[PDB]
């Protein structure tokens, strides 16, 4: 009994610094990624040339209209996206095929590129894993290691990396994650909620301004 | 098990459990110290303050 307990504790410990080393590596990678973008922009400005950042592979989509008076095409699309309520949020692998799909539900959803804090804030607080078709909160790393252990995801930091950086197993990581059930935004929306964001409304693409909405949502 | 969901962002102990890296994170690091190099191409300034 003592040998088994010691063996359990040891292997569990060896898993712990493994998580610690991975999380440290991801944090260093993020800082090195932001440093290089700043250096690339600075040197381009110094040379008079211009630099185009990478277009982010990750998008966060929030549904902003109720389940009423929606055309069946938009209804089916949001069913595919798993946006079955207002304020529901999802991480989607933004690519060529997703863009035209979102062009149809543009009046009904708003989307933009989330930053590290937003994706970290959402998973820690609104993060509920989908285990055995049940909505289970991510209260420990045991759930993550037992549900995504076949894709080398062992902790919350590993899941955050696979989501934020759009890893090879992004589909599995996102599908494991129940849609975020965000609250109504503190402070409220704009005067009109159902115009285009570019026209003073709230629907449609908003790029780096989705973070400001998410802070109110949380 | 898990009778109540505790937010790691408001409860330090839960954050410690889920993230065994918050013990040594060191968010605020010195990169700029003082020796800042003002770098902007004169062509960029001209095209910026153009028209």
């Amino acid at each position: 009994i003592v040998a088994a307990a010691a063996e359990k504790k040891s292997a569990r410990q060896k898993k712990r610094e493994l998580i610690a080393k991975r999380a440290e590596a991801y944090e260093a990678e993020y800082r090195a990624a932001e440093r290089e973008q700043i250096e690339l922009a600075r040197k381009a400005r110094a040379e008079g040339n211009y630099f185009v950042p990478h277009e982010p592979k990750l998008i966060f989509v929030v549904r902003i209209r109720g389940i009423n008076n929606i055309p069946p095409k938009a209804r089916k699309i949001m069913q595919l996206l798993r946006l079955l309520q207002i304020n529901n949020g999802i991480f989607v692998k933004f690519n060529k095929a997703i863009k035209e799909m979102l062009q149809v539900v543009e009046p009904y959803v708003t989307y933009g590129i989330p930053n590290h804090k937003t994706v970290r804030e959402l998973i820690y607080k609104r993060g509920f894993g989908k285990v055995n078709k049940q909505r289970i909160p991510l209260s420990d790393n045991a759930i993550i290691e037992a549900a995504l252990g076949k894709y080398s995801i062992l902790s919350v930091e590993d899941l955050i990396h696979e989501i934020y950086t759009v890893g090879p197993n992004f589909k599995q990581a996102a599908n494991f994650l129940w849609p975020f059930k965000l609250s109504s935004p503190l402070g409220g929306w704009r005067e009109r909620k159902f115009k285009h964001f570019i026209e003073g409304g709230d629907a449609g693409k908003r790029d780096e301004h989705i973070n400001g909405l998410v802070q109110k949502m949380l | 098990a898990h009778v109540q969901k505790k937010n790691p962002l408001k409860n330090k102990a839960v954050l410690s459990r889920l993230n065994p890296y918050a013990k040594a994170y060191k968010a605020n690091v010195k990169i700029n110290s003082e020796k800042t190099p003002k770098a902007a191409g004169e062509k960029f300034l001209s095209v910026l303050h153009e028209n």
Binding site: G48, N49, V52, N95, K96 | -
Partner: peptide, 21 residues
């Protein structure tokens, strides 16, 4: 098709021209 990657856009050959509607 993946998103367009970061690249360079040399303007010394074609300096930006001011456009007015």
């Amino acid at each position: 098709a993946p998103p367009a990657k970061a690249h360079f856009v040399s303007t010394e050959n074609n300096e930006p021209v001011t456009l007015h509607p």
